[PDB]
């Protein structure tokens, strides 16, 4: 429906990682990076459309973009797109290394053991990595 307080906090934390002087803006060239850190997988066309619909993007504009993407993208597609971003090398599995980088790029400071525990919770077939359906199982709850 709309973004929760905890989603807003998480989006602000990711945005702020590219707002180096704290002035509430990122550059238009940084928008894609911030979106990908949040599990969005925008095409070049999608990014340029969002940029044109508003050389900087301020946080209220960004948050409005994110609220619309969250509400209007099909839920199954949202999961597919997030898996595609997080699976950095596209081999069909999120490795522990890839997942550590995802959590770091959100702005979190998880230990390596905490990320291993994320993997173990999701890993149903025991291969130590997270495939697409294992991700769906986590992300549908």
């Amino acid at each position: 429906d709309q973004l929760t307080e905890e989603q807003i906090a998480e989006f602000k934390e990711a945005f702020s990682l590219f707002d180096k002087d704290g002035d509430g803006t990122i550059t238009t060239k940084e928008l894609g990076t911030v979106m990908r850190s949040l599990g969005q997988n925008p095409t070049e066309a999608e990014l340029q459309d969002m940029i044109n619909e508003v050389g900087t993007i301020d946080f209220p504009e960004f948050l409005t973009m994110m609220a619309r993407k969250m509400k209007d993208t099909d839920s199954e597609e949202e999961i597919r797109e997030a898996f595609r971003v997080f699976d950095k090398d596209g081999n069909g599995y999120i490795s522990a290394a890839e997942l550590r980088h995802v959590m770091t790029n959100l702005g979190e400071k998880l230990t390596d053991e905490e990320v291993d525990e994320m993997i173990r919770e999701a890993d149903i077939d025991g291969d130590g990595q997270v495939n697409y359906e294992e991700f769906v199982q986590m992300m549908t709850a």
């Binding site: 929760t4 905890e6 989603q7 998480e10 949040l38 599990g39 969250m70 509400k71 993208t73 839920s75 949202e78 999961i79 997030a82 995802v102 959590m103 959100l106 979190e108 905490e114 525990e117 994320m118 919770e121 999701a122 986590m138 992300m139 549908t140 709850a141």
Partner: peptide, 11 residues
């Protein structure tokens, strides 16, 4: 452990 990733999508 997965709450921050789950928040990235809707159900």
């Amino acid at each position: 452990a997965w709450a921050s990733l789950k928040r990235l999508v809707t159900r």
